[PDB]
Amino acid sequence: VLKARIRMDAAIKRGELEVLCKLGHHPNIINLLGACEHYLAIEYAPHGNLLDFLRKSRVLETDPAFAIANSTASTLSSQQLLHFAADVARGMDYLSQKQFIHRDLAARNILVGENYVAKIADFGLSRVKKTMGRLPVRWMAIESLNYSVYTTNSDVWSYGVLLWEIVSLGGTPYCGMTCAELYEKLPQGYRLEKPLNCDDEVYDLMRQCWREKPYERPSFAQILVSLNRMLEERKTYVNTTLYEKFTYAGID
Numbered sequence: 001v002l003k004a005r006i007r008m009d010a011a012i013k014r015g016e017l018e019v020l021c022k023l024g025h026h027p028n029i030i031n032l033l034g035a036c037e038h039y040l041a042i043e044y045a046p047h048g049n050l051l052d053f054l055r056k057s058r059v060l061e062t063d064p065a066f067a068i069a070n071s072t073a074s075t076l077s078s079q080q081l082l083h084f085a086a087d088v089a090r091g092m093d094y095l096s097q098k099q100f101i102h103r104d105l106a107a108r109n110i111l112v113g114e115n116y117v118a119k120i121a122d123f124g125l126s127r128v129k130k131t132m133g134r135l136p137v138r139w140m141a142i143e144s145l146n147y148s149v150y151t152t153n154s155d156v157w158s159y160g161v162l163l164w165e166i167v168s169l170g171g172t173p174y175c176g177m178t179c180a181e182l183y184e185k186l187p188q189g190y191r192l193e194k195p196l197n198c199d200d201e202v203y204d205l206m207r208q209c210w211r212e213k214p215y216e217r218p219s220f221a222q223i224l225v226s227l228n229r230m231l232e233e234r235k236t237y238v239n240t241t242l243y244e245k246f247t248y249a250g251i252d
């Protein structure tokens with residue numbers, strides 16, 4: 001994958017053209033510009049992947065003097081954070097009505113484009129039982145861990161974890177927990193805990209994505225509605241201000 005001019009900025013990769021074309025276009029997915037050879041051209045995202053971008057906003061760690069002085073934990077606001085969330089949901093709604101199943105929803109696979117508009121991507125390398133590489137276990141629905149099932153509802157569970165990645169600023173999900181104990185504890189109804197900077201209502205939405213029953217989970221259309229409600233309220237939903245006992249959700 002290489003940076004290039006000709007839209008100007010593009011990320012060029014050198015059978016996949018059928019899949020990209022059939023996705024059509026949407027402001028919340030990657031944009032297929034054109035192709036040929038002697039080479040797939042996609043619109044470059046100046047802010048790179050969401051994970052790294054969420055982590056680079058941890059200003060206390062990067063620029064502590066600046067952070068303390070401003071009483072800020074993040075260069076992103078609750079408005080920006082929730083807009084990333086609504087961006088992914090809008091793209092996943094678009095993508096799921098075309099019966100596209102991602103199977104790898106996580107911050108690492110979302111791009112931050114022009115105007116900080118989040119875009120679904122897939123950095124795997126080719127596209128009814130479905131194909132799987134190495135399992136992203138911390139992002140996986142109970143029913144994928146057991147049974148190896150993949151549907152829009154399992155995508156919704158992974159979205160729940162991405163929503164958690166957004167609020168925690170790139171925290172590693174279940175920090176301190178082994179992959180093995182997830183297979184064991186999730187069936188028993190264990191779920192990820194509410195982050196400290198998180199409002200109860202964003203936590204409820206995450207919990208809705210993690211219902212045991214796949215068919216009880218909300219649709220991406222319903223998830224966008226919930227988030228839009230939060231963004232329209234005066235209420236701040238994600239705390240980004242420092243306080244005496246502040247600690248970031250752990251990364252490693």
Ligand SMILES: CNc1nccc(-c2cccnc2Oc2cc(C(=O)Nc3cc(C(F)(F)F)ccc3N3CCOCC3)ccc2C)n1
Nearest residue numbers: 001011013016019029030043044045048120121122126127
């Ligand atoms: C850092 N900035 C940046 N901007 C744009 C792209 C990239 C980037 C970085 C590293 C690797 N790849 C890219 O960009 C992509 C991204 C994709 C990509 O996301 N492709 C697919 C996306 C989707 C989506 F989920 F969005 F609907 C679905 C299928 C996709 N591909 C999957 C691979 O095979 C063809 C179809 C394909 C090619 C390239 C060159 N980086």
